Amino acid sequence: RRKLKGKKPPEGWELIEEVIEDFEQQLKEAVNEEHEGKRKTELTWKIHRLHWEKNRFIYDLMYQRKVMSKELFEWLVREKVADGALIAKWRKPGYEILCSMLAIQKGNHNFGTTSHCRVPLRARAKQQRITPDVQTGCISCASGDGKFGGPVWWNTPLAKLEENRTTWGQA
RNA sequence: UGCUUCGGCACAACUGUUAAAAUUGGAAAAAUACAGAGAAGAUUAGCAUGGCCCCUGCGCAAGGAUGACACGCAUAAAUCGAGAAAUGGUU
Ligand SMILES: [Mg+2]
Ligand SMILES: [Mg+2]
Ligand SMILES: [Mg+2]
Ligand SMILES: [Mg+2]
Ligand SMILES: [Zn+2]
């Protein structure tokens, strides 16, 4: 709603508008899915992956292609279209494909750790090498571990890039 | 992803009461049927006491049949010796 009320969005918003609205429609239907037959912990996995992909479109255009304006990006952050903290993180060295801000909240975890998905899949034991995080669904968002430019999510074949992530592009 | 003597460095570092379960057991209630109320004649107000009895209540109130219970039904032997007499052994 926040973007839709009153005000105008800066120049550029017409390029990203349909994609952003598609991502918002996908999140709208993820919230509405049914949860019978899947773990309690996996409720929000699709929401987290979709939130990642949405902010990764905003990130892709703002910092990897740099086709987004500083004022448009600052608008998206201010109007809550972009997760500003998560995109800010992806800029930090070592947090380049971080799956969620939950994964590196350390009060979030029993032993005061980050989550096991932040740990390079090699340095982990076979027990923590195929299990997705219970909150985010990420198996490995350690930079270096990423398939297709993103994390290794619950179902990421360690197939083809097109079958494993949303591929916006500019047709 | 920076930095790169382009060799590689740097950064980043261990989620999960792990189930979409499986058992697993214990529970209040319902009906049924039982049976179904203090004090001394009857009818009745209560306030207590005691505690491995609780319930309602925010309760250091108040209430729950004086909340209940107990409460004795004491077959709680609370028990026995004094002396004369008299009889039994022994001399
Ligand atoms: Mg009383
Ligand atoms: Mg009372
Ligand atoms: Mg009365
Ligand atoms: Mg009483
Ligand atoms: Zn992760």
Q: Can you say which residues of A are annotated as belonging to the binding site?
A: 99, 117, 138, 141
Distance in angstroms, CA of A144 to C1' of B6? 19
Distance (Å, rounded) from C-alpha A88 to C-alpha A77? 10
For this entry, resolution in Å reads 2.6
Judged on CB neighbours under 10 Å (0-12, 13-18, 19+), A51 is buried
Tokens coding A100? 């969620």
Tokens coding A110? 């029993």
Q: Which nucleotide is nearest to A63 (CA to C1')?
A: B1
Query: Going by DSSP bridges, is the β-strand pair A152-153/A138-140 parallel, antiparallel, or unpaired?
Result: antiparallel
With distances taken from each CA to the C1' atom of nucleotide B12, the closest residue turns out to be A94
Calculate the alpha carbon distances from A133 to A21, A114, A115, A118 in Å.
28, 11, 7, 10
Distance (Å, rounded) from C-alpha A133 to C-alpha A9? 36
Who touches strand B, with Cβ under 7 Å?
A 36-41, 64, 92-97, 104, 108-111, 113-120, 123-125, 127-128, 131-135, 142-144, 149
Judged on CB neighbours under 10 Å (0-12, 13-18, 19+), A127 is exposed
Distance in angstroms, CA of A42 to C1' of B14? 20
Q: Can you say which residues of A are annotated as belonging to the binding site for Zn(2+)?
A: 99, 117, 138, 141
Amino acid at A152: V
Give the three-class secondary structure for A40.
coil
Give the three-class secondary structure for A20.
helix
Answer yes or no: are the C-beta atoms of A85 and A91 closer than 8 Å: no
Q: How was this structure determined?
A: cryo-EM
The set of residues, in sequence order, having a beta carbon less than 8 Å from that of A133 and lying 6+ positions away, is A99, A103, A115, A116, A117, A139
Half-sphere exposure (Cβ direction) of A139: Cα atoms closer than 13 Å: 19
Residues in chain A: 171
Tokens coding A19? 């994609």
Q: Where do we find the tokens 């985010």? A: A136
A162 CA distance to ligand 3 middle (Å): 82
- Please provide the DSSP assignment of A61-120 as one string: IIIIS--S-HHHHHHHHHTTSS-HHHHHHHHSTT-TT---GGGG-STTSTTS---GGGS-
The set of residues, in sequence order, having a beta carbon less than 8 Å from that of A100 and lying 6+ positions away, is A48, A51, A52, A86, A135, A136, A138, A141
